């Protein structure tokens, strides 16, 4: 099925084969892998659980991103098909593609969230630390080899066509190292579970509606979810 | 639209991307009014008859249509759809090419671009009326190989049976038998299939007994077969301008 | 053991790294194999049997080839090795490369030579049909799938590095389609099989020597090798 | 020769083709006199002196040397060797970098470039004389990409123990002993070992006691280790030129 990459901002988004045959056996031996089971096999819903939580870390504030969802650097239809899905390449060297990098949410053996994936700039200024649960995604850490090129972030989960806002539930607002403000999606696919939206206590829980006065901060785009400029620091509780 | 690939049995900008500015001043240009505005009916006129040499028997093309070299499930995109390399080469790709049938000023058919081998064995020249399909002459210039055919229209993902209309079966270039379609796209027309007089005009039926003649190196299975042959350019030419 | 580029006429020629990594899974599934059994175990010399000739195309006329052998287009240390390693561009487009190709001779199941693969220009001009008995070389066939990229003459055995003219026993010289005289190879590595050069009745059976007179014949290089200009037309005896 | 990768564990070709003359008018320049001209000795003075923050202990270190973070089980040669990227990004390679000891117009050692890591927990300052050696200097522009310090000595193949010939010992920015490597290429200067006064200057034997000593992340062995991190230019810089 196209599931896939049925969460893509992308409306324009063969392609398959596009992305997948291009890539050699050293890096993608059994080859390219998706995830299974993001959507309920019953209901045709979004699986909203801790094994499919997801998150991006990304400078852009809310305004922007709870509104147009996460849209690829190659955002227009004449795109040059070839170089813009080339995953590898876009893996190892941060090229501008169709695709959106997020990363898994890490928990220990007892349901309690750990520390995920973090970018190296993360203490400095504003980042933010978008919470996502979205159909499909490629399976990085499937689909290839640990210690072999394009080197990625095994932790990591790609979005062909990027992600539609629906699927971002939630995100930090962090300033230098520091949770400043909790924002959520009341525009969120499963509203039910807007409820369920964890965080620090102390710290203002807003909620997100377009043009907000104070979601719009940022520094004065898929740079801090590049493999090599974050790593997981440790296995430390939140 | 999507007309360029009607006839077939994202894609657009993997080809049209990898083309040099020199290679085609103009750009990728398609076969206009394939199709009635009003209808959307296969505009079935002189203007838009073309010609598919192949050495391949009705009993296949009148029942698969014509499907290209590389289907979906051995495509490798980026290369598979190489038009250039296609049009250069004869490489295995997704393209099925085709000629345009010719006409004096007159509206009299004269020679179209045929294979050299024609008059050799068992060849076939099936008659199409499909929606789309390139327009390399207007795609390129003399340009795109060293002896281009001004007159190839090609088919991304082929041609299906229901727009072949009709075929003549040569035998050391001498046509033996007419072969109708039955299952055309508008067999209303089917009637207007010209050809010479005291040469039995058949229709086909699939399994047809007599619908399976060709050379014998196409049975010989064990050896592929490059059945886009006799339409690659270096391997025909328009001979003369005379009426047929 | 780097026999599988031993008879290399490439003088300054990791190397199989660089080639096999970039192949991509649907080309080479089993990756890149390189001919076995070329050499004996034993005598270590090359193994000059039916199931190992192999056969080569060219226009080039024995006064260079029985003197210089089969030296790839990229000839020159300082290479752009990133261009001119790359196999599956050269199967598909012919691009000049370190490689050259030769094509498996064939044999029906009583051992007797049936046409092998032919560039169609065969019956035009002056062509040479060249025999050749070398180490290693990689085996097409069994690198790459049938029906899928780069489409590469399955009977095709291709020699980074080229091959020496040691290696190259004889060549049949043909006019027009037509044997005109056959070369032997003086200088061939193994002379005491310069006996079994087989080859058609009543045709001037010549031994090469440099500079020969008549050694130099031809149209007024690896274009009638290639793929898509050449086919095995048909199992017919020789 | 080949003495520019002497000390390791096409290639030059592999790496040079991928350096556009823009950035590297006059091309790669490996360092020289790095050996002796008669002899075959490694040049060990203060010219060719070098250095490497690294937070493995010697036990690991003094064992192994320095070792890429692909070897060549793993080794994919066109970006495995890419270094400009490797320069810009620290994405893995064969190289492993080190940075030129500095000294004034005295022969007293200054500070060289420093990691911003330095003061915090436990790392490594490790002293290194080998042979060749890409000369970053002298390869790129600094009003150019990728911004190394121009104080950095790349190789590739990485660097053996043998030409490791002591580290210091940091715990929170204090330096806490000095380690020696009886195995060093030229034991007869294992003598000529600076360091503070009022500092156990230890001799390194395998799977020593105390050369183990290493932040808690190495530990974690399931989280592969990002080794090359303080040597990474954006990482660091020459603080001053004081002397030490």
Redesign the interface.
């Known amino acids: 099925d196209n599931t896939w990459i049925q969460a893509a901002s992308l409306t324009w988004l063969?392609?398959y084969?596009?992305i997948?045959?291009?890539?050699?056996?050293?890096?993608?031996?059994n080859?390219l892998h998706m995830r299974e089971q993001t959507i309920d096999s019953n209901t045709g819903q979004i699986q909203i659980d801790n094994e499919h939580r997801l998150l991006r870390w990304d400078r852009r504030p809310p305004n922007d991103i709870f509104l147009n969802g996460f849209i690829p650097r190659v955002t227009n239809?004449?795109?040059?098909?070839?170089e813009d899905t080339h995953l590898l390449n876009y893996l190892?060297?941060?090229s501008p593609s169709i695709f959106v990098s997020t990363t898994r949410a890490r928990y220990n053996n007892l349901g309690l969230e750990i520390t995920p994936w973090t970018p190296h700039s993360a203490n400095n200024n504003i980042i933010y630390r978008y919470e996502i649960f979205a159909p499909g995604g490629i399976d990085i850490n499937a689909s290839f080899?640990?210690?072999?090129?394009?080197?990625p972030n095994q932790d990591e989960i790609t979005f062909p066509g990027g992600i539609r806002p629906e699927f971002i539930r939630s995100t930090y607002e962090y300033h230098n190292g520091e949770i400043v403000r909790i924002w959520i999606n009341p525009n969120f696919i499963n509203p039910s579970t807007l409820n369920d939206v964890s965080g620090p206590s102390n710290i203002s829980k807003v909620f997100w509606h377009e043009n907000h006065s104070e979601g719009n901060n940022m520094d004065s785009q898929d740079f801090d979810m590049?493999?090599?400029?974050g790593?997981?620091?440790?296995?430390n509780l939140l």
């Open positions: 063969l392609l084969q596009l997948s045959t291009r890539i050699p056996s050293f890096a993608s031996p080859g239809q004449n795109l040059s098909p070839v190892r060297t941060n080899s640990r210690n072999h090129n394009p080197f590049f493999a090599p400029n790593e997981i620091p440790n296995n």
